[PDB]
C-alpha cells in the first residue's frame, strides 16, 4: 500500500513487462502460459497472451486492458505501451519516492507526451512507397522464409509489394484503391520459382469445365454462381404423356431441359463464361457448352465472390435467386474483359482477365514447393499489412526506433528549458522511451546500450531522416538492432500507432500513480 502498492503496481508493471519484453516483436519469443491448470500455451505478443494470462493485480489487470484498449485500436504497441508503462512508473516512482509529488511529476510527463507527439507530428514521410515502409522489398524479404523465394528475394518482394502497393484489382464492381483490400493474388507451386508471376486477371482455384466447353473464351460476360446447379429432382414437370419408355424418363428429363432452356436463356441474355461455386451436373455444363458458353464450376468462393463482387451487374454469386436456373436480365451479367483457362504453375486454371467492364490483376506464384506458397503467403500478409498502413496512411514517421534516441534528446532539449522539477519530469518521461531498442536488442540478443547510445550519438539536431544518418537519426534494424535508413532496412512507423501507445501508457501509469491505497474487509 502507498509506496508499497505503488511499488506493487510497479511490481505489477515489473513482472508483466518482463514477459512482454521477451515476447516483443518477431524477436519476441513464444512463452508457456498456463491457460487454466493442465492447459499451458506457448505464445508471444503479450496482448494476445495477456488475455490468456490471469493477472495478480488490478494494476496488471488495467494494463492488460490498456494494451487490449491499444489492441482494439491495433495489436501493435500493445506489448509496448505496457512495457512503456512499466518504464514510466519506474521512472517517476523514484521521484515520487524522493521529494516529488505524484501530481507534480506526471505534469512534465503528459505535457512531454504532448511534446514527443509534436515531434512525431513534425516527423513524417508522405512517400512511404518507393523507399517503402521498412524498405519496400525488405518487408516481405524479411518475412520471406527464403527457399526458392530468396533468389527472388527482391524479385518476389518487388513483385508482390509493388503488387501490394497498387496493381489493378477490381473491388466489388471495382472500387479503385490499392488491392490489399482484397488479394486474389495467390500462389501455386509448379513450373519453377522465378516463373512466379503476377497475372493480369483473376486467379482462380477452380473446376474448369469439360465436355466441349471452349477452354478459352475471349470477351465473355460471366455467370458467377454461388449456386450448385445439379438437377432439380422431379419425376414429372413436363410431358406427362406415357408413350415410349423413352417418354416416362423423358418426363423426369425435364428437370434438365428447363435448365438447358434457361442455361441457353442465360446464354441468350448473356454470358460465354460461367463460374459456379458448387457443382453443375454433366448436362448443365453441357448446356453451357452446347450454348457455346465456357462453364467453370465448383469455383473457389473467396476468389469467386471477389470476382462476383467485381464481375459486374448483379450475379448468381451475388444473387440468391435460383429457379432451377434463371434466365438473365443482363443485370445478372458477370463481366470478363477476356476469359482464359491458361496453364499457370503447371496448372491449367481459368484466369478471368480483369472484367468485361472493369479491371483486375492477381498473382499465382509458381514454385517448386508448397512451402514457397506457405511463406510468401505470410510475406504477403506482412507486406499487405505493412503496405496497408502505407496505403490508408501515407503519413508515417521515418524509423520506428530512431525516434527514441532523438525523442529523449528532443525531450532532453525540451527538458532543460522547463526547469524546476519538470525539466526532470520530461527527462524521466524520456527515460521511459529507452526500452524500445532494448527489449528489441534483448530479444535479438543484442547489446541495447551500445545501440541506443550510438543512436543518441547520431545527430546535429534531432531528426529521423536518411539524408543525415550521421547528423540526424534514421530508421532501425531488428536482428542487429542498429539504425537503418528507409529503403536500407530502415524501419518506419505509421504515425497513428505510437502517439496512441504514447498516450495510453502515460495515462494508465498516472492512474496507477493515482492511488496510494487498496483496502478490504
Amino acid at each position: 500500500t502507498g509506496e508499497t502498492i505503488r511499488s506493487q503496481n510497479v511490481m505489477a508493471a515489473a513482472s508483466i513487462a518482463n514477459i512482454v519484453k521477451s515476447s516483443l516483436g518477431p524477436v519476441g519469443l513464444d512463452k508457456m502460459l498456463v491457460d487454466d491448470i493442465g492447459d499451458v500455451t506457448i505464445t508471444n505478443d503479450g496482448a494476445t497472451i495477456l488475455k490468456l494470462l490471469e493477472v495478480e493485480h488490478p494494476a496488471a489487470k488495467v494494463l492488460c486492458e490498456l494494451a487490449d484498449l491499444q489492441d482494439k485500436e491495433v495489436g501493435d504497441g500493445t506489448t509496448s505501451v505496457v512495457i512503456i508503462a512499466a518504464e514510466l512508473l519506474k521512472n517517476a516512482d523514484e521521484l515520487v519516492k524522493q521529494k516529488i509529488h505524484p501530481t507534480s511529476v506526471i505534469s512534465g510527463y503528459r505535457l512531454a507526451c504532448k511534446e514527443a507527439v509534436r515531434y512525431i507530428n513534425e516527423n513524417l514521410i508522405v512517400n512511404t512507397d518507393e523507399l517503402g515502409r521498412d524498405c519496400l522489398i525488405n518487408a516481405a524479404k524479411t518475412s520471406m522464409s527464403s527457399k526458392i523465394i530468396g533468389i527472388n528475394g527482391d524479385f518476389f518482394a518487388n513483385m508482390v509489394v509493388d503488387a501490394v502497393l497498387a496493381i489493378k484489382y477490381t473491388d466489388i464492381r471495382g472500387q479503385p484503391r490499392y488491392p490489399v483490400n482484397s488479394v486474389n493474388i495467390l500462389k501455386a507451386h509448379g513450373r519453377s520459382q522465378m516463373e512466379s508471376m503476377l497475372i493480369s486477371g483473376y486467379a482462380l482455384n477452380c473446376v474448369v469445365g469439360s465436355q466441349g466447353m471452349p477452354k478459352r473464351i475471349v470477351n465473355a460476360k460471366i455467370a458467377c454462381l454461388d449456386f450448385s446447379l445439379q438437377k432439380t429432382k422431379m419425376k414429372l414437370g413436363v410431358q406427362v404423356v406415357i408413350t415410349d419408355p423413352e417418354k416416362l424418363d423423358q418426363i423426369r428429363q425435364r428437370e434438365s431441359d428447363i435448365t438447358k432452356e434457361r442455361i441457353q436463356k442465360i446464354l441468350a441474355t448473356g454470358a460465354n463464361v460461367i463460374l459456379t461455386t458448387g457443382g453443375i451436373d454433366d448436362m448443365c455444363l453441357k448446356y453451357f457448352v452446347e450454348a457455346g458458353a465456357m462453364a467453370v464450376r465448383r469455383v473457389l468462393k473467396r476468389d469467386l465472390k471477389r470476382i462476383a463482387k467485381a464481375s459486374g451487374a448483379t450475379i448468381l454469386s451475388t444473387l440468391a435467386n435460383l429457379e432451377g436456373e434463371e434466365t438473365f436480365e443482363a443485370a445478372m451479367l458477370g463481366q470478363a474483359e477476356e476469359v482464359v483457362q491458361e496453364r499457370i504453375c503447371d496448372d491449367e486454371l481459368i484466369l478471368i482477365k480483369n472484367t468485361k467492364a472493369r479491371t483486375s490483376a492477381s498473382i499465382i506464384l509458381r514454385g517448386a514447393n508448397d512451402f514457397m506458397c506457405d511463406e510468401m503467403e505470410r510475406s504477403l500478409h506482412d507486406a499487405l499489412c505493412v503496405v496497408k498502413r502505407v496505403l490508408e496512411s501515407k503519413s508515417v514517421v521515418p524509423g520506428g526506433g530512431a525516434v527514441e534516441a532523438a525523442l529523449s534528446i528532443y525531450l532532453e532539449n525540451y527538458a532543460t528549458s522547463m526547469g524546476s522539477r519538470e525539466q526532470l519530469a520530461i527527462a524521466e518521461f524520456a527515460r521511459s522511451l529507452l526500452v524500445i531498442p532494448n527489449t528489441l536488442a534483448v530479444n535479438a540478443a543484442q547489446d541495447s546500450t551500445d545501440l541506443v547510445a550510438k543512436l543518441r550519438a547520431f545527430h546535429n539536431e534531432a531528426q529521423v531522416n536518411p539524408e543525415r544518418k550521421n547528423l540526424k537519426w534514421i530508421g532501425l534494424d531488428l536482428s542487429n538492432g542498429k539504425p537503418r535508413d528507409n529503403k536500407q532496412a530502415g524501419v518506419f512507423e505509421p504515425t497513428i500507432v505510437k502517439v496512441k501507445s504514447l498516450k495510453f501508457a502515460t495515462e494508465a501509469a498516472i492512474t496507477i500513480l493515482r492511488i496510494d491505497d487498496l483496502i478490504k474487509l
Binding site: 524477436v27 508457456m32 494470462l53 507451386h189 445439379q230 438437377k231 432439380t232 429432382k233 454433366d282 540478443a445
Partner: protein, 509 residues
C-alpha cells in the same frame, strides 16, 4: 510464472532426465526402465511412448517433450524414442554456456545450419535403394523387424507389408507422394495362418464387414457408394411435415417411395447386385433397392466407402440423377464376402486405383496375427520410409560420426559463435554410438576415438560402432541400414523442440 535460465536449465533438467535410461533402451540391447506404480503396477519397457504417458511429468517442458514424441509417434512411429534424445542434447550441451555467453538465437540459428548439413551429408551417405528389389527393401525391413526383434512371423509381415506397401504405394498431389498409408488397409482375422494372409487389389473391407454386409459374392456386379442426396422426399421435390399419423404415412410415402425410386432406379443402371448406403440411408431408401432388385446395405462408415473409393477405386458421387460405375464402383469390381475363420469378410477386388492392394491378415488366432500385425504396421512405416526416401543410410555411428566432422569443420569454417552450437551439435550426435557402446558393454571413449579414427580416414562412411556387437563395423557389410527420411525426420524433429525450449523463456499462467 517461471522463466529464464532456471527454466532454460529446467528445460534441460526436464527433457534430459527422460532420455537417460531411454537411450539405453535404444537398440535391441536395451535397459528397460522399471515403472512401479503408486498402485504398485510394475512396468519394464524400452519404449518411451509407453514410458512417457505413465510417468509423472514434473515440468511443462516434459508436457512439451511428450508432444514431439507423440508427433513422431504420429509422424511415423519409428524412432519415437530417438526424437527426445538430441533435443535435450542441443540444450543440454551448449545452452547454459551460450546464454551465459548470451543468446537464444545464435544457437537457434545454428539449429538449422547444423540441420541441413546432416541432410546434405546424409544424401551423400544415404545411398539409394532398389524398391524394384523387394529384398533390397526386405533386408532393411528384415533389419527393421529385427529392430522390432520378431524375425519369426514378422519376416512374413515384412513381405506382406512390403508387397502391400509397394501396392499401397501411390499418391498424387501433383508433387506425387510416393506411398499412401491411409490407403493401406489391413484385416484382423482369426483362422487361417498369417502365411496364408495376403494382399489383394483395392481396399479389403473387414472394417464394417465381419458378417453379411454386401451379400456374399458379388462377382462383376457393382457396389454403390452413395454420397447423395438420397433422402426420401416427404413431398416430391419438397420436404413437408414428418410422419406422425396415418395420413402422413399415406400421403407422404406416396411422395417418398417414388423419389427413392427416382433415385435407386438411377442406381439400377450401373449394374449393382449390392448397394452400400452411406448417405441417404433411411427406412425407405434401402427398402427400395430390394425393390430395385439390388441388395441394399445400411448406415455404413464412409471411411470404408473412402477406402472403398480406393477399393474398387471409384469416387463417390452426390449426384441423385447420375449414378454409374465410373461415378461409384469403378472397374469390373469384385465384391466377395468370404468367411475367413467364422467371420464373413467383404473383399473388394478388381481395383481401379493405381497399384493399391490391401492386406488380408488371417492368423490362426487374432493374437498369432497380432505379432505380424504390429510389425507389419511397423514395416509399412519402414517400407514407406524406404519409399518416401529411397536412400538407405547406414544405421548408427556411420551416419553419426560422419556428420559431426562436417559440422565441426562447418563450425570451424564458420569460426563464429555458432561454431559452438555445431561443436555442441556434432558432439550431441556422438551420444548414440556412445550410448550403443554404453549399451553394448564396451568402453566408449576408446571406441569413440576409434570411431573418430573411423572418420579421420574413412569418414565413417559405413563405419559406426554396432551396438549389438559393440564394435567398429561396416554398416554396408553388416546390412545395418535405414532410410534417410526417418533418419532425417526423427533427427530433424529432435532439432525442433531444442529450438522451442530455447526460444521459450517464460512459463506463466
Amino acid at each position: 510464472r517461471e522463466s529464464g535460465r532456471k527454466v532454460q536449465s529446467g528445460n534441460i533438467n526436464a527433457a534430459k532426465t527422460i532420455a537417460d535410461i531411454i537411450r539405453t533402451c535404444l537398440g535391441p540391447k536395451s535397459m528397460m526402465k522399471m515403472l512401479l506404480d503408486p498402485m504398485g503396477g510394475i512396468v519394464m519397457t524400452n519404449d518411451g511412448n509407453a514410458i512417457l504417458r505413465e510417468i509423472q511429468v514434473q515440468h511443462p517442458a516434459a508436457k512439451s517433450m511428450i508432444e514431439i514424441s507423440r508427433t513422431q509417434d504420429e509422424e511415423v512411429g519409428d524412432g519415437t524414442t530417438s526424437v527426445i534424445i538430441l533435443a535435450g542434447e542441443m540444450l543440454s550441451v551448449a545452452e547454459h554456456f551460450l546464454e551465459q555467453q548470451m543468446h537464444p538465437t545464435v544457437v537457434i540459428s545454428a539449429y538449422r545450419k547444423a540441420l541441413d548439413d546432416m541432410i546434405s551429408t546424409l544424401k551423400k551417405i544415404s545411398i539409394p535403394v532398389d524398391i524394384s528389389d523387394s529384398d533390397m527393401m526386405l533386408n532393411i525391413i528384415n533389419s527393421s523387424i529385427t529392430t522390432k526383434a520378431i524375425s519369426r512371423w514378422s519376416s512374413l509381415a515384412c513381405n506382406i507389408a512390403l508387397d502391400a506397401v509397394k501396392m499401397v504405394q501411390f499418391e498424387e498431389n501433383g508433387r506425387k507422394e510416393i506411398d499412401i498409408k491411409k490407403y493401406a488397409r489391413v484385416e484382423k482375422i482369426p483362422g487361417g495362418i498369417i502365411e496364408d494372409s495376403c494382399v489383394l487389389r483395392g481396399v479389403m473391407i473387414n472394417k464394417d464387414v465381419t458378417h453379411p454386409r454386401m451379400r456374399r459374392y458379388i462377382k462383376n456386379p457393382r457396389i454403390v457408394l452413395l454420397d447423395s442426396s438420397l433422402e426420401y422426399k416427404k413431398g416430391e421435390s419438397q420436404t413437408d411435415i414428418e410422419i406422425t399419423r396415418e395420413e402422413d404415412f399415406t400421403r407422404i410415402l406416396q411422395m417418398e417411395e417414388e423419389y427413392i425410386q427416382q433415385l435407386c432406379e438411377d442406381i439400377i443402371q450401373l449394374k449393382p447386385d449390392v448397394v452400400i448406403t452411406e448417405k441417404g440411408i433411411s427406412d425407405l431408401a434401402q427398402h427400395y433397392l430390394m425393390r430395385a432388385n439390388i441388395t441394399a446395405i445400411r448406415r455404413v462408415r464412409k471411411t470404408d466407402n473412402n477406402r472403398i473409393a480406393r477399393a474398387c477405386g471409384a469416387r463417390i458421387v452426390s449426384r441423385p440423377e447420375e449414378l454409374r460405375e465410373d461415378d461409384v464402383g469403378t472397374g469390373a469390381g469384385l465384391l466377395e464376402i468370404k468367411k475367413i475363420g467364422d467371420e464373413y469378410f467383404t473383399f473388394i477386388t478388381d481395383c481401379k486405383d493405381p497399384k493399391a492392394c490391401t492386406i488380408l491378415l488371417r492368423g490362426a488366432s487374432k493374437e498369432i496375427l497380432s505379432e505380424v500385425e504390429r510389425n507389419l504396421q511397423d514395416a509399412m512405416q519402414v517400407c514407406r520410409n524406404v519409399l518416401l526416401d529411397p536412400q538407405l543410410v547406414p544405421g548408427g555411428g556411420a551416419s553419426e560420426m560422419a556428420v559431426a566432422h562436417a559440422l565441426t569443420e562447418k563450425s570451424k569454417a564458420m569460426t563464429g559463435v555458432e561454431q559452438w552450437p555445431y561443436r555442441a551439435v556434432a558432439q550431441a550426435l556422438e551420444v548414440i554410438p556412445r550410448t550403443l557402446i554404453q549399451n553394448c558393454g564396451a568402453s566408449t571413449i576408446r571406441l569413440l576415438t576409434s570411431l573418430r579414427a573411423k572418420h579421420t580416414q574413412e569418414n565413417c562412411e559405413t563405419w559406426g560402432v554396432n551396438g549389438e556387437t559393440g564394435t567398429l563395423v561396416d554398416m554396408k557389410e553388416l546390412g545395418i541400414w535405414e532410410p534417410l527420411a526417418v533418419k532425417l525426420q526423427t533427427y530433424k524433429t529432435a532439432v525442433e523442440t531444442a529450438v522451442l525450449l530455447l526460444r521459450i523463456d517464460d512459463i506463466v499462467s
